[PDB]
Write a protein that binds this ligand. Structure first.
Ligand SMILES: O=c1ccn([C@@H]2O[C@H](COP(=O)(O)OP(=O)(O)O[C@H]3O[C@H](CO)[C@@H](O)[C@H](O)[C@H]3O)[C@@H](O)[C@H]2O)c(=O)[nH]1
Ligand SMILES: *[C@@H]1O[C@H](CO)[C@@H](O)[C@H](O)[C@H]1NC(C)=O
Ligand SMILES: [Ca+2]
Length: 276
């Protein structure tokens, strides 16, 4: 397909949002789309419904089942294992014939033609991530990356959010990025205090040697970090956790994104159509 997106979802709530993410992508593009799923975390009901979504929204899809290598340090916490699947196996999850894939979070709402990210220049980087917003000034106390360890490590480089990222698989394979990320993760994870945010900390840690193309800030907006004024420019939205309010996930979705209920109700209408 012209646009290839992968995502990971574990739980009924994240599968419900994953269907919404997919409908939002297809409402904003006429280019061909293929969705790739990390199979082992999904429910039987989701896997049964995905051909119905595919036929209604007009996309292709594929399930990838990749076993965690025995040598590689395992993660006992399911959340951390799922983070490992986002970042450690980018060279082995997809076929050698696929040249590019984008990770889009299951809780995202897309408001752009995702082919614009496929066409974005990476200047030789094997992947691109958006930076964490600095625009919501009242949240500065929670930007852990602006002081301590990260401020000294980064030397003014951005601390990137891992909700969305484009992977040029040809370049990623040319650089042996997959083998190098697995080895650094294995060494660093011997310390259980390292890589607190595994999927996010690992590429940010490796960005002096596995380059990151810093994407336009508009590629990823999250209310927690980003101003209300920049929402209108946002290409995609992440429903990231707000450590100050601790607002529930579905409340954030309905309150922030006016079209969320429309996609949710449309997918539920498709489900009642297939059921009868
Ligand atoms: O498929 C999923 C994803 C998350 N959770 C749980 O939901 C809670 C909160 O996680 P989540 O909704 O993923 O937090 P976000 O704030 O959305 O996550 C942000 O920060 C994470 C790194 O900390 C990145 O992986 C995400 O892409 C980014 O959106 C945790 O208990 C997770 O285990 C699930 O049950 N299933
Ligand atoms: C898809 O094609 C139709 C053709 O009339 C056009 O109106 C619509 O804007 C196109 N959408 C995108 C995202 O290109
Ligand atoms: Ca998220």
């Amino acid at each position: 397909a012209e646009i290839n997106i992968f995502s990971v979802a574990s739980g009924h709530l994240y599968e419900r949002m994953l269907n919404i993410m997919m409908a939002s992508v297809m409402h904003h593009t006429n280019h061909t789309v293929k969705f790739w799923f990390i199979e082992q975390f999904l429910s039987p009901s989701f896997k049964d419904f995905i051909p119905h979504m595919a036929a209604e929204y007009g996309f292709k899809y594929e399930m990838v089942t990749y076993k965690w290598p025995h040598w590689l340090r395992q993660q006992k916490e399911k959340q951390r294992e799922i983070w490992g699947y986002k970042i450690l196996f980018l060279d082995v999850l997809f076929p050698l014939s696929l040249d590019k894939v984008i990770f889009v979070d299951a809780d995202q709402i897309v408001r752009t033609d995702m082919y614009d990210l496929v066409e974005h220049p990476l200047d030789g980087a094997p992947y691109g991530f958006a930076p964490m917003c600095d625009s919501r000034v009242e949240m500065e106390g929670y930007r852990f990356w602006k002081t301590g360890y990260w401020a000294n490590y980064l030397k003014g480089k951005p601390y990137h959010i891992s909700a969305l990222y484009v992977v040029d698989l040809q370049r990623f394979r040319e650089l042996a990025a997959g083998d190098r990320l697995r080895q650094q993760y294995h060494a660093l994870s011997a310390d259980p205090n390292s890589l607190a945010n595994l999927d996010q900390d690992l590429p940010n840690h490796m960005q002096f040697t596995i380059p990151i193309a810093t994407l336009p800030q508009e590629w990823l907006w999250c209310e927690t970090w980003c101003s209300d004024e920049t929402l209108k420019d946002a290409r995609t939205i992440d429903l990231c956790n707000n450590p100050m309010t601790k607002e529930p996930k579905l409340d954030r979705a309905r309150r922030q994104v006016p079209e969320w209920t429309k996609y949710d109700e449309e997918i539920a209408e498709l489900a009642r159509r297939v059921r009868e």
